[model samples]
Target: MSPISVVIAGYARSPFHFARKGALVDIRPDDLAAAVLKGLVEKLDLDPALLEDVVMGCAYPEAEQGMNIARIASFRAGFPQSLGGATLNRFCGSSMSAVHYAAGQVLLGAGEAFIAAGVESMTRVPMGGFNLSPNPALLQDYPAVYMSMGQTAENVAERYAVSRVEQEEMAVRSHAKAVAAREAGLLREEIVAIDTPAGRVAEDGCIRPGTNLESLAQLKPAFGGSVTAATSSPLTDGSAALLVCSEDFARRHGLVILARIKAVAVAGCAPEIMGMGPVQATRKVLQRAGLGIADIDLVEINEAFASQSIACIRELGLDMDRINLDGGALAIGHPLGATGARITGKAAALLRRTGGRYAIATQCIAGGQGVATLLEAVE
Candidate 1:
């Protein structure tokens, strides 16, 4: 069979680090999910019936987020009933895993176009709200295994000997880069400005315009019983979605291909060191794509914490200049499951700018799992 080329023809994203009037929107997981789906359907004017399925990655699949949000959003978005939906949870990699799965189906001729995405409103239903039970033995043997994401960063910082000064420096650098990218309108062409009840909330929120080492240094650490705030990812709410289609489907619809789903890799490691999870997963993806670290023209490693971000880059020996060119979770809220798709969208935009072939998007989950997916510019 011929190789399958899965391309993301279009997408939509919500705002981040919202301080005021955000509560007015107060969109539920289902509502947020539906917003993105409707945006795609209406913007592309593609019949939902043409979509083979709807796949979504959501960590807390309970309450409003439960009952198969993908299908609910699809139906609410006016998709045909024949189109099925499946909810996925690969820790934080949930949405990208959906993308990977959808790409696989298209490559194997199992289906054609599909929506692969991630959504989470941490403000509506904070993460860890839904009761989740893990193996008692696992939790007992490794206490940090069940530790919050903040503790994981502290663990990596302690184990890897990452320093506070460096952490602040990294955050300072992120804010700086993000500010530059925004000023130059790096993501202006790609992002669809979203109009909400709270007004137009388009740009990522966590970014600080006048950031400096002196200011970042004054901040306190969030975890490990410290005053340093750099140790934690902020509570954020957002959603992101992508429209993927096979070559035949693209031709049939006259869709303009932005980029291709080149390769994807998900790797698991010891839960105790979960912060470093992305490194292993990322390496596997690079190797599978026959790419070296240098070959990745750009990277979008979620900044769960400066420690892990530093650890992953140091371990993988990636050029800092090429990573998170538009800031990361540290500067724009994690929003748990939504971050993977957000970062991937950012990576695609980066590829468009640099005329680069390969870009890597990777993140760490609650457990010891890491997921990394690679994309290549097709044109």
Candidate 2:
């Protein structure tokens, strides 16, 4: 059977915050997801009853985030009990993988409309809160897979010969770009003002407007001597949601289709150098879509670590000017599960702004995997 067309109706996200110290720190993960879901519905003037399912990504789904948080968030957002909801975890790619799940259902004709959502309160759950205990035999066989994410990044930097100075420079540039984008209001359309007890959290809290290399150089290393805290994405708190449906459903509802899902691809690599996952995934999607990197107008590559992202960019032969034109995780913060949806949402808006046809959002997962999705603006 031929594939069905999928279109994005709308996308919205809460301002990213610095884990425990930011505006969203007091909010629960489910509440963050609910806020974005409600905002998206209101922005699209959508009926909550029309949504068939809600798939959310949460990296650390323990404590308050446990018990299928997606279902709880959907109900909290006032969706009917009949609506189906599920949650998934793909580490850094969780939310983007949520998009893959929803789009796959639509492509299979299983559902016409769905919501792909993501949320993470790193301040509460904290990374590695799940307390995973891998089998000793498996770790012996593949120790790299179980290595700490920071160590993996250091491995990439060492293998690729990415210097500390280079990584620091990239981080500096990331913050600068984010500040410029914020000033230019390039990110306004995609963000939703999240109501918090301490007034409204209307803007991202992690971006440093006048950050420079000298200040970054003063930061201590996180792993090895080269991988400094300044070069790595910070633990953040945020949520995002996207309204996606079959093209027919969108047209019938007279919704303005923002972008079409062209393709999605996943690839795996040695966990020691999982940062290379994006290079492989991007190639797979390009091949599947019969396009090349040059055909993509914008690329949103998650900067899990500046070292890995720079390495991936160099390996893929991507134009530096095209990758993360509006900044990246280095400056905006990486809320793990929410990052994928957040970047996907940003890509759609960037395509519309540039009047570009094709854009790709890709991320290097924490577990030796990568996810890449190609999107084409409706224009």
Question: Over 4 Å off in model 2, which ranges?
Answer: 1-3
lDDT of 2 by residue, 342-375 (tens): 8887888788878999999999998799999999
What's the CA RMSD of model 1 in angstroms?
A: 2.3
Give Cα distance to truth, residue 243, candidate 1, Å.
Answer: 1.6
lDDT for each residue of candidate 1 in 95-129, tens digit (9 for 90 to 100):
87887888888878888898887778777766776
Q: Estimate each model's TM-score.
A: 0.92, 0.97
TM-score of 1: 0.92
Question: Which has the greatest TM-score?
Answer: 2
Clashing pairs in 2: none
User: Deviation in angstroms for 355 in model 1?
Assistant: 0.6
Task: Estimate every model's Cα lDDT from 0 to 1.
Answer: 0.76, 0.89
